[model samples]
Target: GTITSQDDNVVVGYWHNWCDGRGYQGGNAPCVELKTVNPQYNVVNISFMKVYDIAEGRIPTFKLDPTIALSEAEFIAQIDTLNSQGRSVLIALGGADAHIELTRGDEDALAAEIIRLTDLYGFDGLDIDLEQAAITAKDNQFVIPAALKMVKEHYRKTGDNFMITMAPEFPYLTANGAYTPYLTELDGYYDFINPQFYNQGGDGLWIEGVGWIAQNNDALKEEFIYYIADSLINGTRNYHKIPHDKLVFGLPSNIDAAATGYIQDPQDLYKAFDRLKAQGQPLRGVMTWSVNWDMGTDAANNSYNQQFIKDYGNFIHNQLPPVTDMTPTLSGIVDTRVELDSHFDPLIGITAKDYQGNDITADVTVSGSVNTNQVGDYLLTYSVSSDDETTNQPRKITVYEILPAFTGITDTTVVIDSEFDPMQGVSASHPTQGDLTANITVTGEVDTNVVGVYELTYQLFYGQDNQQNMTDKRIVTVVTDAVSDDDWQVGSTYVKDDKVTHNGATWTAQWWTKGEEPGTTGEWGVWR
Candidate 1:
């Protein structure tokens, strides 16, 4: 089997021919008629054709219901009309209340009957809606799969388009179900599986091995559809996998179709399709229980088909709107208050992209204030317009007065009793504030009267609110001169400028020596 991609999303609806105003039991519904079906539907399944008889050695025969409004010829003509509009008409086999039995011996005859019906009514395909006995019967295990394969091969030889689809209850196809063998055998031959995701009621979608039903109802409702969708694609309980594109989610179009599972609003169901696409599933599309029940009249006298035509049609065929991508490249800290006359360009490296992943940076227009001389916050706007969609992004830039830079005021060491000034040689210069040496304030006293070190600081203030400031420091020490009360020892060592009291007199040493008298003033002597 060869795989083909659909040009547009799939929108399938079940069309019950027996719905002719007598209600569902008479196989009639008040709202719908065959001719009134909206063209928005890509596929309409005629529900249903049943086994009229078994003749000529267990070969089954099929026919439409007696209560149906259209005759055999009228049915063919309607199918032709729908086909001309690029829509498919398929014969649905079995129903929730219908019985369809198959056996291995009847495979060839059954395949022939389906081919006969297709040739007579001009149906593009067939839908297997087997429920109850038809699906659970042991004879059907091999019989249906074999017949479908035979019919599919017959069309393949004639170079005609034949689609085979299935609509099974959720449990029948998931987690150790009887249909697993049939699905595995006809994996590639089948076009798609439209699992009946509704009507089971009250947490019935749960598969023991899957465990999605045990989750919170509200949270589960958000993603429950996709979880079941994934099980079909990836296969739970070791069942054979179906391609994501070959799965269609099935739901009730109206609340009356099923008590519990009908989506209150169709938009919620559409969102599930979108979510599936977002997750890379790219599943085929959606299938509704019955198009007949979906019909309704509004105060404006418009049919519900008109709303569905727009809503479902747009969802399947419309393109998404283009979006703007405006992600900042600069750091958040850069938006803080910066010095005036400093280099600041908010739009310097900013860029943008389109929803289609194209670079639209050059197409972006930047506007707004960026006065570097002003000391306040300013807004910068960036915008891009493409395909009639526009987006704007704003950025903030703050400016403050630049403080003067102080130099030549490094920490210093002073001898005891020495005088010091913190700003003696210190000067301040700003890139825009200019020379600020006169405005620099000197504080903290370095006392020459004390014997310990002291601190002196230089400070400069700038900006309107004195927000910009600079500070530097220096150190000074105080001490006393040498005394003459001590006696000089012969073994004492002295340096070139060492002053000492020796022999009742204050004397200065001329050079270093280990042992020498203070009165000796020769070149080799230690004192002068």
Candidate 2:
């Protein structure tokens, strides 16, 4: 089935690829068939690629156990069907019981084997579940990193989409753990990290800088999950950073899968997701230990997958609103003013539309109006009612008194020592009647004698109201006449108060004399 309104969050289920059937509740529990998985489970990882043998002394070979029900062709067909429905399937290497050994020389061979299996099985990606000795083994230090790097680089060169993921125990991924170095090295290559938070018991403490504390209550469960998520997302273990979007919070699906860490109510798990989102960490998704244990015999014969879909699937997927397809658009400006008896129609350009992109403009109803005879702020609303939903959009219309207008007044520039009158040719009038020249007043005064820029304002008033007046302005520039050393004729003039420039200094004539330059010593004290 095709999914509708899918959320951004991923839902990954680990399928036991090797287990045909297991005894549960005194009956045989058949393995979950690949084609039967719900569409909501976007990613399914085939678990446990156990070691086949140590080929050629150091190269480790792996195989899917033959006990599985599906044949090679059937599995390929299943992958194709899932992929057609926008889902992904990956092969997970290593499990709790599996052992993997690798040396520096075996990196290339191991990478080639991984590529071979991915191609052979039509798998989208690979998941590393290396546990126990493989995580911290001295010889295996650079082995996995090199293999992952080679695979990632090869895919990059070929322009193929390939994802690499890791599922490590919580302790191994915590601050200063054994696997931290390898994860740090392969940081960019790995797509996401799913740290198993179960099996560590309820009292398992998430140690802060102050060290281990008790996880004693249910209220602290979400907090504990948040702490682990924060550490992985923000790099608490000495600055080993992984993006928050690349983390999938992992837990057991049922109580039978893990004794202590199974959250009975799925809502608590949802709450944990909510907490992470509240902190601005939009995680990749959620992962369970195994989908095999999720099956239940109920009235609806539901599985954990179905239960998750029912309880919070829409919430997890961030579903869109029901009335999003059609919306009413308000036509007029949000805030505008008009005079009494002025033509005003808020619905002039109003429109509405349906999902098929058809204009349903006629279906929209505009209810509010602005009274043309009144003077105040009026809100005009346009609304559309479709099916069970309705949307209302509002626009503000302000009706104000007719303000006076000023004509024949334009911005002008004037030179220094020039005469200027602001209201020399300006006139004022109301919209309908009355020449308001008497109500016009000039406010700012420009000094025509000064040698600087000045501004003069002309205003026309209709009443005592603040917004009833109209205003205009003009600019004035006052400048000095040209002054040059050549303008000062030596031995030409004799006066008492004549001004002239000499020797780069302006001087007033005090008993002016011929050939006496300004700033010349003692006898030119008369020139000063």
Write one digit per residue (lDDT tens) for candidate 1, span 347-426. 56665554333456677777887788788988777787665666675777888774468887776666655566666777
TM-score of 1: 0.53
Pairs in clash, predicted candidate 2: 7-317
lDDT of 1 at 14: 90
How would you encode candidate 2's per-residue C-alpha lDDT over 63-116 as one tens digit per residue? 555566677778778888887887878778777655577666878987898888
What range of 10 consecutive residues in model 1 has the weakest lDDT sum? 324-333
Regions of candidate 1 where Cα sits further than 4 Å from its true position:
1-7, 20-28, 31-33, 53-61, 65-67, 204-219, 236-240, 296-311, 319-528
Task: Give the TM-scores of the predictions, in the order they appear.
Answer: 0.53, 0.53
lDDT for model 2, on a 0 to 1 scale?
Answer: 0.65
Candidate 2, position 350, lDDT:
67
